[PDB]
Amino acid sequence: VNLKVTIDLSNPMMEPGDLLHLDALLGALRVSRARAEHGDAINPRDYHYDLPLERYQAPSGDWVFKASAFKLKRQLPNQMWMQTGRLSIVEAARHRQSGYLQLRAGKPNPAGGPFKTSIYHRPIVQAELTAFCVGDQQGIEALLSECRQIGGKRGVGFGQVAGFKVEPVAETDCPWSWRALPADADPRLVTSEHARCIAAIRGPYWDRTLHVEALAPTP
């Protein structure tokens, strides 16, 4: 069908390290749908490939999904978010006296451990997210109806979806090739911004054990 998807945001989102792939979003959405439709005790490996997309096979094995990465059009300047983590030492002391806490140590450590105070900063972007993929529009709408967040499923409030839209477009307009690809991809599919690296091309893109020698685009 060769269609193209935009998501616009009611909340700013985490700017993704490497590429936010649309098939990763659809896989997480299908995992959530399978959690609703079976229950909680399931394998997420089973259903995060059950996607209404096309599957491109490279000339000697190394198959990937036919879904390009999310291109970002910044509505806002790329700001930064800070978050911190620390266990409240005062309640720990009162629980240590009350007997509810069993702590042999009589001193915390903000540089490391359970009472470590940690500060960390992540980029924040408010953007129009446009991806390109070949597949069925109805299934992508049914998946993205549950998509309340994108980029980070943080549970803390980021990336809340104002809306989404899928439209079919012509073949020559669509740059599907802008995606993490295997190194044995076709010569018409390799572009200049693609470069050879270690990257995941499929499924869980955070899982470094599945990371392969791949040719991928730069965000």
Partner: protein, 328 residues
């Protein structure tokens, strides 16, 4: 399911922001160099998209509480108000690494990556407290999505959505409250006020010459210790402001929603600030809407009795071995 808590802060809201922020004595934020400046810790604000003005999107500041503060506040009020009395009426003794997993979002039960079977993932996500946040070495996704405390403000109309146009604020919502510390040895009046000091007059005089020598040496260096005499500034969000709080639960049980409801029943004693000395962040709850239906009353929560019975039989049955098995 969604819980929207509309609260008004009785006292100002202060959630400190990073960076080096400088204000003059008049009020100019971030002056150019060559003029006297001042240390300032502003409340936390994000640049958010705005369709106000024109149809094109402009970046406007919006002064919020971060969602992590909301998540930890909800967590800590469930521990302080229902979880801890239940676990000390039974005699349960938590361990550090299980206490660190329940009270913080940390993995010091085992710093190692603990493998998680899908059955044990299911049996810990259905726990009345544990499945809301998760945490620990399992690093499993908690069911509770806690949003930032958003003020009902025209800069947040994209975040707030339609329906909050009635009872809505505009314009500036931050006031730079100036605070100070005086050296209290200078406040010492006479022999009756100074007799409690070891040394008394001699010690007070010695601190006065030490502070004088340090200040004149610092001023001569201007043309590394520090005294007690400070005077600084911090932006706070104005008191009496109305705030919305979005708590969306990803396929919850009845006991988990009951635990969130009993948190909202007792969170009037909690605070939301970096101003605990100054009683900042005291709030009262004006509305709690479950799935679009308001449930808050003046005498706590009236409604959702199935959630209340579920959370009663949930917090009665816990024996803290599930917390220990959640940690390791």
């Amino acid at each position: 399911m969604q819980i929207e808590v509309t609260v008004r802060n009785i006292t100002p809201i202060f959630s400190a922001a990073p960076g080096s922020n400088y204000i003059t004595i008049d009020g100019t934020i971030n002056p150019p160099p060559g003029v006297s400046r001042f240390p300032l810790v502003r409340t936390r604000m994000m640049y958010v998209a705005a369709d106000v003005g024109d149809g094109v999107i402009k970046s406007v500041p919006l002064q919020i509480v971060p969602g992590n503060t909301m998540r930890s506040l909800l967590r800590r009020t469930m521990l302080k108000h229902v979880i801890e009395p239940a676990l000390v009426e039974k005699g349960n003794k938590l361990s550090i690494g299980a206490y660190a997993t329940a009270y913080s979002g940390n993995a010091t039960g085992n710093p190692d990556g603990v493998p998680s079977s899908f059955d044990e993932i299911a049996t810990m996500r259905a726990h009345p407290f544990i499945g809301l946040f998760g945490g620990g070495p399992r690093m499993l996704e908690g069911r509770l999505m806690v949003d930032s405390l958003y003020p009902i403000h025209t800069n947040a109309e994209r975040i707030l959505g339609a329906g909050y146009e009635n009872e809505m604020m505009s314009g500036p919502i931050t006031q730079v409250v100036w605070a100070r510390r005086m050296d209290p040895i200078l406040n010492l009046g006479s022999s009756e006020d100074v007799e409690v000091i070891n040394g008394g007059a001699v010690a007070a005089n010695g601190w006065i010459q030490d502070l004088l020598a340090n200040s004149k040496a610092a001023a001569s260096k201007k043309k590394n210790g520090r005294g007690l005499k400070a005077f600084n500034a911090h932006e706070v969000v104005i008191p009496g402001l109305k705030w919305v709080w979005r708590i969306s639960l990803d396929r919850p049980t009845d006991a988990q929603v009951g635990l969130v409801l009993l948190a909202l029943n007792k969170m009037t004693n909690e605070r939301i600030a970096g101003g605990h000395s100054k009683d900042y962040g005291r709030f009262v709850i004006d509305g709690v809407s479950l799935n679009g239906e308001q449930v808050w009353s003046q005498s706590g929560i009236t409604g959702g009795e199935q959630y209340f019975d579920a959370v009663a039989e949930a917090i009665d049955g816990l024996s803290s071995k599930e917390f220990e098995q959640f940690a390791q």
